[PDB]
């Protein structure tokens, strides 16, 4: 356990808490001596607002660390705004995952096309064409997804998967004409 000293107005409250706790638990422990509901607490540590989800020890918090508490009567507005971003980031990421699974399946057909050829067989130009366009459709779906950070990295890697499978299909088509 550790001693964290939270200033609220001119009053300082000392809270004994385990360094593995989240900032959310710290807020909950503060409701008692301050009267402020945890959802309404803005906690400042080293001039930085701390997300309830973040953990004390990871965050640098040590014994005798100093924080500031500020009440926010408009917290709900802020919670819904944050949930909205979280929900949007998730939707885009899941949209790319779904496409990724469709790309797996189309790639399954490209690989089977390669094997067939290697093994002396022949694949109809029409079937190669179809899979190329099915792949282009997945590419177009990918371009429709607004993304940044890790989700954009995800989008770009699926685009690269698609472009590789198509390059292969193109090579097959040339080989057979």
């Amino acid at each position: 356990m550790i001693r964290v000293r939270i200033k609220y107005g001119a009053v300082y409250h000392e809270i004994n808490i385990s360094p593995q706790a989240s900032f959310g638990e710290l807020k909950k422990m503060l409701t008692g001596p301050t009267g402020i509901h945890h959802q309404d607490q803005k906690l400042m540590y080293k001039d930085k607002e701390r997300d309830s989800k973040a953990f004390l020890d990871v965050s640098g918090v040590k014994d005798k660390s100093k924080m500031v508490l500020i009440e926010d009567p408009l917290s709900q507005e802020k919670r819904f705004l944050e949930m909205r971003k979280i929900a949007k980031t998730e939707k885009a990421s899941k949209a790319i995952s779904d496409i990724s699974l469709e790309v797996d399946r189309l790639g399954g057909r490209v690989s089977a096309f390669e094997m067939v050829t290697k093994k002396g067989g022949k694949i109809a130009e029409k079937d190669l064409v179809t899979v190329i366009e099915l792949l282009m459709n997945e590419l177009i779906k990918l371009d429709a997804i607004v993304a940044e950070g890790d989700v954009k990295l995800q989008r770009k890697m699926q685009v690269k998967r698609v472009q590789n499978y198509v390059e292969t299909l193109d090579a097959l088509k040339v080989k057979n004409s």
Partner: protein, 376 residues
Amino acid sequence: AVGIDLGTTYSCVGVFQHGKVEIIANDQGNRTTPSYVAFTDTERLIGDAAKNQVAMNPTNTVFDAKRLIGRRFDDAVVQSDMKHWPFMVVNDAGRPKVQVEYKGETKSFYPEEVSSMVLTKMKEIAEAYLGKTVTNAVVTVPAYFNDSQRQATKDAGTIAGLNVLRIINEPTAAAIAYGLDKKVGAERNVLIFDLGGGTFDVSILTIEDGIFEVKSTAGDTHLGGEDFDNRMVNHFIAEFKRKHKKDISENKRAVRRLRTACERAKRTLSSSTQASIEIDSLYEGIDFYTSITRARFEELNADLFRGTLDPVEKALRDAKLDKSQIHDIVLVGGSTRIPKIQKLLQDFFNGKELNKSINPDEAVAYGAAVQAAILS
């Protein structure tokens, strides 16, 4: 009874129930349905399913049938249009027919037969919604259609199992949607500015005690939103060349992607002042992360936009009317959502407020449906 906007690229169906019009969404939840019929070796698709597999099966996916209805194979415009459509058009004793491969065989269809298929679908969309069969309809056509074109459109309805109560003009349908005929008193001059579905039509009507008369039509049969997308596409092709010394214009896959992204950006610019464009690995592994302001979009289209006032002027003159004698201005068609279009038109009418609150893709079917209810 239902009203159907049988449009050149999309169609829309409405039904007047409980003292109100409802515009009916199809199976995918869309309130408009592509006027597309596609033929495969196994089946025949209509609507969204047809438009969706177009890149897949381009020479057997028919669209733009409305541009052939009532025409002669000989018509310069037909022979000219044929060089652009991927499907075939053949001559049947002077009459045009689209020609495709269906279940292995070569088949040909009159423009109206293709339209009857679109109508059947619009019918079925409504029936699906009502849980009851639909027998009677009003179907719309452009004001400049002749009796031959009107009749063919009617026959299309008939083949689709519809009793066509009446064929009415699209601009008239739109004026009806806005209740202009119920603005009682002295005759009213109405200008309908319809920019959408790959065509641009300006119509002037006079309404007198609820009787409609077409005073003049003007416009451009080959101006629509694709022209605006093209200016954006070419702009960005240029940008890529100024940034990477590469010309993507020959790579069809890259152009398709940029075109599609440009279509999205255009719509975004109708409600925002800037749009962001991102295409990963567009060309030779080169990402394209850029953007465009509404202002730059307007500039690229400055001539096209301004030029929409030319048919407005021609239509006025031919009606023997000065701008100042127009009592009602109506905006219809998807492309009238472009702010710069709306501004150019209002300004040209010295500030007068435009009728535009009704979804521009729907106003026509809305008017058609009102009329259908009156006629039934």
